[PDB]
Design a protein around this ligand. Structure first.
Ligand SMILES: [Zn+2]
Length: 255
């Protein structure tokens, strides 16, 4: 799979609106891409990055209230991954293969075969740091987590947990039932693995909930009482300070 050819195929569609979508991969719900423009396409290290959005002059969206910057889709091509332009592949005597995704433009369409398709932060950040990307360097992440500093400070480090902000920090911390100020050296590997997995789970879940616009129920973020019902405490901590919520009863400090 030479991704240079794939990029050459994708290039004529850059700047064109997406009319409709098809395929059998509905995990990302590609119908979000309707009436959006393929604003950019780039290739870096066995991955293909496509950007969809509505950017007008000066970088402003179409309709503005004072009162986004586009979505990035990552395509990780395996040994037999491929993309087609205005044509569909046929089987080689093993029924025709079904494309994972088909994007329709007025000029033509693109079909992607045998590839992993997931949202990502984009090319600007290294995929190893990206928490959304499947190619997430969990070795690097745990090496960062085992440091002396409290877990909130390490989690907010974009070099190793890129894309992780305040809300994900608080929710992932409550889900593992660990205190925000607990040290990464003074935590069990069980809790560390649970936290690291909850990162990847809650990130993609929250992203999918936010894209579809469905109302999201916050567990501990800006909540007066925890799910169990204990009063929630609020204070500011940082390595630059940020607002934090935690339940001391649910999340002991644990020396
Ligand atoms: Zn509680």
């Amino acid at each position: 799979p030479s991704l240079r050819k794939f990029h050459q195929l994708v290039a004529p569609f850059v700047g064109q609106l997406v009319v409709t979508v098809g395929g059998n991969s509905k995990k990302i719900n590609p119908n979000m891409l309707e009436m959006l423009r393929l604003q950019d396409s780039q290739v870096h290290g066995k991955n293909l990055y496509l950007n969809f959005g509505l950017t007008e002059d000066l970088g402003l969206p179409e309709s503005f209230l004072l009162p986004n910057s586009g979505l990035w889709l990552c395509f990780h091509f395996g040994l037999f991954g491929s993309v087609r332009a205005s044509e569909l592949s046929r089987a080689t005597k093993a029924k025709d293969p079904i494309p994972r995704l088909v994007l329709h433009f007025a000029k033509g369409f693109l079909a992607f075969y045998n590839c992993r398709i997931y949202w990502c932060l984009g090319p600007t950040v290294k995929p190893t740091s990206d928490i959304l990307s499947e190619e997430f360097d969990r070795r690097q992440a745990l090496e960062a987590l085992k440091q002396a500093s409290p877990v909130s400070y390490t989690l907010l480090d974009q070099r190793y947990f890129a894309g992780l902000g305040n809300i994900i920090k608080n929710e992932v911390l409550y889900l593992a039932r660990i205190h925000p100020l607990s040290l990464g050296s003074c935590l069990t590997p069980l809790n560390l693995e649970s936290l690291l997995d909850h990162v990847v789970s809650f990130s993609v879940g929250w992203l999918q909930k936010k894209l579809e616009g469905k109302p999201l129920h916050h567990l501990i973020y800006q909540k007066e009482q925890c799910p169990a019902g204990h009063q929630v405490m609020k204070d500011s901590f940082g390595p630059f300070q940020r607002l934090t919520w935690w339940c001391p009863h649910c999340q002991p400090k644990a020396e």
